[PDB]
Design a protein around this ligand. Structure first.
Ligand SMILES: Cc1cc2nc3c(=O)[nH]c(=O)nc-3n(C[C@H](O)[C@H](O)[C@H](O)COP(=O)(O)OP(=O)(O)OC[C@H]3O[C@@H](n4cnc5c(N)ncnc54)[C@H](O)[C@@H]3O)c2cc1C
Length: 459
DNA sequence: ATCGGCTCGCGCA
DNA sequence: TGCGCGAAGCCGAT
């Protein structure tokens, strides 16, 4: 590759081969943005060294049927804006429909690709697709970490027990890896599905319409105006956070009645904005130092340790990935009698006895983003009022992935594992049902914020 | 061959 | 509200 502000350690070879005659193809998956994208940039750099065009390919899977119209519209509306952004950079974008394992392979043959580059996800499905693609192509294949500031395989070579073991290794490498971004260079070389993306959205929304979330009077639950989608909207949210919410963040990040969070998770999850970008802007901002340490810890340690978790523990969304002490503790309490037991359907409709739990579910149903403090309480009550730890993990993941705009994310699996299974936490006083897993109480919540205001806001 | 230090609830102001 | 301890398993600095 060979260039300024392009550390070679951000890229690694999935497969070696003979470089092809054709264009460099960036298989975009996790990081759906033109700016501050190390994978797009590396793909562009390979293109310059080889005197070839860079092109972006994206696969429209049947995974959308798993979630709702809320996330399909957010992603697809974002992708319509992205096609236009990429087009201004003279970068063509190709949208394939179907299975990435077969469709990426066929595209490389059909479009005569020279080099394949993709971004990094520690999720099982991306790795499965990469394995399939490797078996179907002759060309060199590179992986670039565009999501984490320090590349996941570089920060640590093993599972990290706690944030404290991770913090020294990540912080030692931050001076090297926390750096500004080069501008994306438009295409120099002339670049050689048929449906419109609007058509795809229309066909997909008709397929999802029967199962769309409705209130009892037939009126839809989802309010689409809370987070407008796309790269342009993402940046406006980051700007208002620094301007309006970062000063109060150290004091108020755990009060759900206050709108004092970044609101960046839906854009971060789809890769509509870079975490490295957000950290650069926050570092430079003159703000309360307590707020800066609190927020940088969240977007650097906690977000990037969630990738460490999924990358070194392939069963990240199961019981086995919990630490020994936690699995041992939860196992001993499997027979304990739950105070309540709710089904997925009762949980989903917000019909528990706990008005605070119900309000947290209604914030999830109506806005698509539950406040970060109540997500801890929400997941820990699923554990407390479920038949088993496995049923709890299953119900929390089902509701999180169906209804959160930021769901189906390593942060989600690491966050749920912390809450239910103690991952990256320590043991606490033993209790019935939840054992030594950290406990959170309705009364504890009453002490810390105006619980009644939150409940009133969400019926 | 031994210890300091890690993202709650509670009792106290 | 803000503070110090309790209950608690283990990592790694020494
Ligand atoms: C049960 C549970 C489920 C969760 N599910 C998800 C999910 O599906 N998707 C998701 O992106 N996050 C998830 N989180 C982490 C966190 O709640 C959200 O990222 C955060 O509330 C998003 O809102 P924000 O971006 O306004 O938060 P901010 O406070 O502004 O945080 C900014 C960023 O810091 C990172 N961050 C903050 N808290 C955490 C954390 N605990 N772990 C990892 N990264 C963190 C995120 O990237 C987040 O976007 C979950 C946490 C819990 C306890």
């Amino acid at each position: 590759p060979r260039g300024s502000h392009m550390n070679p350690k951000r890229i690694r070879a999935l497969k070696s081969g003979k470089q092809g005659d054709g264009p460099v193809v960036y298989w975009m998956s996790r990081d759906q943005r033109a700016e501050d994208n190390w994978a797009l940039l590396f793909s562009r750099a390979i293109a310059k060294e080889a005197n070839v065009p860079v092109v972006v390919v994206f696969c429209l899977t049947d995974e959308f049927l798993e979630a709702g119209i809320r996330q399909y519209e957010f992603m697809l509306k974002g992708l319509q804006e992205l096609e236009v952004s990429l087009s201004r950079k003279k970068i063509p974008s190709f949208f394939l429909r179907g299975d990435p394992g077969e469709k990426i392979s066929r595209f490389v043959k059909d479009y005569n690709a020279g080099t394949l580059v993709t971004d990094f996800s520690p999720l099982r499905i991306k790795n499965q697709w990469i394995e399939k693609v490797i078996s179907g192509i002759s060309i060199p294949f590179f992986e670039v970490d565009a999501h984490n500031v320090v590349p996941c395989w570089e920060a640590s070579q093993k599972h990290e027990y706690a944030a404290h073991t991770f913090r020294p290794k990540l912080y030692a490498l931050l001076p090297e890896f926390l750096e500004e971004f080069p501008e994306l260079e438009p295409n120099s070389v002339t670049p050689e599905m048929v449906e419109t993306l609007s058509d795809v959205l229309e066909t997909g929304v008709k397929a999802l319409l029967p199962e769309r979330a409705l209130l009892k009077n037939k009126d839809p639950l989802f309010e689409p105006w809370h987070f407008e989608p796309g790269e342009k909207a993402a940046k406006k949210v980051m700007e208002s956070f620094i301007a309006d919410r970062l000063d109060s963040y150290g004091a108020l990040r755990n009060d759900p009645t206050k709108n004092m969070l970044s609101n960046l998770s839906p854009y971060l999850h789809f890769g509509q904005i870079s975490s490295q970008r957000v950290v650069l802007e926050v570092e430079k901002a003159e703000s309360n130092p307590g707020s800066k340490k609190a927020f940088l810890d969240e977007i650097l340690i906690w977000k990037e340790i969630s990738d460490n978790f999924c990358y070194y523990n392939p069963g990240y969304d199961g019981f086995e990935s919990f630490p020994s002490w936690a699995k041992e503790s939860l196992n001993a309490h499997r027979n304990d009698v739950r105070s309540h037991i709710y089904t997925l359907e009762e949980f989903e409709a917000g019909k528990t006895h706990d008005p605070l739990w119900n309000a947290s579910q209604m914030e999830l149903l109506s806005t698509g983003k539950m406040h970060g403090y109540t997500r801890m309480y929400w997941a820990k009550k699923i554990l407390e009022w479920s038949e088993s730890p496995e049923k709890a993990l299953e119900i929390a993941i089902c509701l999180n992935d169906r209804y959160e705009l930021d769901g189906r994310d390593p942060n989600g699996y690491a966050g749920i594992a912390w809450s239910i299974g103690g991952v990256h936490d320590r043991a606490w006083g033993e209790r019935e049902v939840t054992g030594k897993i950290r406990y959170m109480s309705y009364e504890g919540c009453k002490r810390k914020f105006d619980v009644k205001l939150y409940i009133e806001k969400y019926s």
